[PDB]
């Protein structure tokens, strides 16, 4: 296995019926609450209890990150309560690990992570290659519902002698 997850999500609150559970089996009942984005903040530490769903972080390619110090999930074992978070403390891949992460909190909205601005390796922070394009990942429509009509295509990039293959959606 690689870039996969067992169970380090959940922790969602129902709150209002805004369709936040739309992407759980999203074959139907998918839609955007209101579309007519802003730059993200620095990458530090995460809080597990409020985050709902997998947190997708963007190096050259999409990668899932499990809770720091590792978590469990099998049943029938004596113990009490789950509260373990993950880390995203990262600088840009050439000098560090990845650009920035993106997730959806407990009420149904999206929270983005990012790095301080200074071609994509120089000043890029989030999954957004350009304002009109973004890196396609299985839960893109969930974190960015306004980008449903974006057209997808396959590209390739370099980040220090390693070729990364990507699917990207753009406005046209």
């Amino acid at each position: 296995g690689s870039w996969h997850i067992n169970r380090t999500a959940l922790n969602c609150n129902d709150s209002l019926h805004t369709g936040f559970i739309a992407s759980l089996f999203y074959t139907h009942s998918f839609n955007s609450s209101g579309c007519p984005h802003y730059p993200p903040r620095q990458c530090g530490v995460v809080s597990a209890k409020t985050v709902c769903g997998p947190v997708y972080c963007f190096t050259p390619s999409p990668v899932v990150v499990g809770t720091t110090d590792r978590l469990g999930a099998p049943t029938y074992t004596w113990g009490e309560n789950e509260t373990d978070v993950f880390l995203l403390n990262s600088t840009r891949p050439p000098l560090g690990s990845w650009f920035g992460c993106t997730w959806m909190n407990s009420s149904g909205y999206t929270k983005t992570c990012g790095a301080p601005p200074c071609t994509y390796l120089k000043c890029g922070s989030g999954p957004w290659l350009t304002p009109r394009c973004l890196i396609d990942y299985p839960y893109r429509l969930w974190h960015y519902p306004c980008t449903v009509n974006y057209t997808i295509f396959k590209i390739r990039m370099y980040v220090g002698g390693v070729e990364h293959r990507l699917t990207a959606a753009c406005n046209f």
Partner: antibody, heavy 118, light 114 residues
């Protein structure tokens, strides 16, 4: 480029079938088109076909339709070229390559030599 | 199918010379939307796998030295080496990545004069 590993050279009896493999390393095949190209001894490169592992959509060459069959397994990050009822004209080196939106074969494999003889 | 014709077939140039080889397609490979020529060049060294040198007729692939230049447009293209080294000995193919099926060229075998 990107790392691709093909199966060993295969000797096939005339009239049998053979399934060649192409394993990707360091990336996911869902993000690239996987092409298969044959090269016959002292002959030019001849494009067999292509596949999109994201949806399974294949696209073959009019001359290889019915004999060549391209499949892709995303859980194992592998591509497969099935050749049915081979003849002496099929004795060739089969390369698997990757391409992006431009359909330009940037990364290739080591090649699989398929010899059809009795 | 698009019929690619490479010229010449055999080619022998001494070390350090500038060598040119032409590729002509039966159909213009120019896409009027993006104004780009859909042609790629491949280098196959003896007993090796082909390597992409220059795609989109002019865009040089990352890693290839800048001594390889892909020029030309429309129906006529040319791969040139400003200063050929002893390691540039290979067979050079041209392939249209425009319409299905993607046809390759006949092949220009490049010898080296010593």
């Amino acid at each position: 480029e990107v790392q691709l590993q093909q199966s060993g050279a295969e000797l096939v009896k005339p009239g049998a079938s053979v399934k060649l493999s192409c394993t990707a390393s360091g990336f996911n095949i869902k993000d690239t088109y996987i092409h298969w190209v044959n090269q016959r001894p002292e002959q030019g490169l001849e494009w067999i076909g292509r596949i999109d592992p994201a949806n399974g959509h294949t696209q073959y060459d009019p001359k290889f339709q019915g004999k060549a069959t391209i499949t892709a397994d995303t859980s194992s990050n592998t591509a497969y070229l099935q050749l049915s009822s081979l003849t002496s004209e099929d004795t060739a080196v089969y390369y698997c390559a990757t391409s992006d939106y431009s359909y330009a074969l940037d990364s290739w494999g080591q090649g699989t030599s398929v010899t059809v003889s009795s | 199918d698009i019929v690619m014709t490479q010229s010449p077939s055999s080619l022998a140039m001494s070390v350090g010379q500038k060598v040119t080889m032409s590729c002509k397609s039966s159909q213009s490979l120019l896409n009027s939307n993006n104004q780009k020529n859909y042609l790629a060049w491949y280098q196959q060294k003896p007993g090796q796998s082909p390597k992409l040198l220059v795609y989109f007729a002019s865009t040089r692939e990352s890693g290839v030295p800048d001594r390889f230049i892909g020029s030309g447009s429309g129906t006529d293209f040319t791969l040139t080496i400003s200063s050929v080294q002893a390691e540039d000995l290979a067979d050079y193919f041209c392939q249209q990545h425009y319409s299905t099926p993607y046809t390759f060229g006949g092949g220009t075998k490049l010898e080296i004069r010593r």
